[PDB]
Amino acid sequence: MSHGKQFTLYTHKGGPNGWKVTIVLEELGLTYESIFLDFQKGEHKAPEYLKVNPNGRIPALIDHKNNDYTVWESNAIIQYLVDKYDKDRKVSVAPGTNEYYTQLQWLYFQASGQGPYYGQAAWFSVYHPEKVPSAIERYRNEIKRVLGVLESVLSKQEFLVDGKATVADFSFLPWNEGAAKFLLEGSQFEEEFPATAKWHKKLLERPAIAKVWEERAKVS
């Protein structure tokens, strides 16, 4: 491609799910061009992009070193990336093992248990055209539930897929940061979910991830 990096990444300056992918890209030392879409201008619903993802959401990924193979859904992308490009197993477990499917389990918990429900909280709190306290409450409570699920595990073992930091852990970061900052009361995160918070903060301190967060902060 013209930008000359291995990957095109369709993403967004603010939402968590593009940064979710970016984290793994950086961890794997891969090169990528971030294409930031403007939702306000409906760029995610435009014909050109719908070609890339007919869901018209971000993120999506094009691998210019693989016959411009294109894939979307953040955790699908992430699976592609570690499987193909983490053969040394820095931040992932091997395909074709029991552990792989525990890894996958946690990725699915992330993509279907954390993201969607956190996002409903996001929506109703700020962006819903009327305030609905019952709806707000519902999804506030679910955030707490999900966090409690994580706490129940992380208090007993260091990482989700026991033994080592993996993408399974990384995948939770952007949504959990959102919640820590704007969906929960300040200090509720540290107080109520001490294990999870430690696990989260330490991960953000990985050099690669810290790098990405810096960039995140910049396009704030």
Ligand X SMILES: N[C@@H](CCC(=O)N[C@@H](CSSC[C@H](NC(=O)CC[C@H](N)C(=O)O)C(=O)NCC(=O)O)C(=O)NCC(=O)O)C(=O)O
Residue 104 binds which one of a second copy, ligand X, none, with CB within 5 to 8 A depending on kind?
a second copy
Residue partners of 71: CB distance under 8 A and separation at least 6: 60, 61, 63, 77, 80
Q: Which residues pair with 68 in a beta bridge?
A: none
* Cα distance between residue 167 and residue 73, in whole Å: 14
DSSP state of 128: S
Print the binding letters for residues 152-191 with ligand X: x by CB under 6 A, - otherwise: ----------------------------------------
- Tokens 């820590």 sit on residue: 180
Q: Choose the stretch contacting a second copy; rule: CB under 8 A; options: 6-14, 36-44, 95-103, 208-216.
A: 95-103
123 binds ligand X (CB under 6 A): yes
Residue 128 binds which one of a second copy, ligand X, none, with CB within 5 to 8 A depending on kind?
a second copy
Question: Residue 4 CB, nearest distance to ligand X (Å)?
Answer: 25
Q: Which residues pair with 70 in a beta bridge?
A: 62
Contacts to a second copy from residues 120-149, by CB under 8 A: 120, 128-130, 132, 134-135, 138, 149
Question: Residue 108 CB, nearest distance to a second copy (Å)?
Answer: 4
47 binds a second copy (CB under 8 A): no
* 57-67 per-residue burial string, b: 16 or more CB within 10 A, e: under 16: bbbbbbbbeee
Residue partners of 85: CB distance under 8 A and separation at least 6: 28, 30
Question: Residue 103 CB, nearest distance to a second copy (Å)?
Answer: 9
Contacts to ligand X from residues 18-47, by CB under 6 A: 39, 44
Angle at 202 between CA 198 and CA 208, to 5 degrees: 155
Question: Residue 88 CB, nearest distance to ligand X (Å)?
Answer: 26
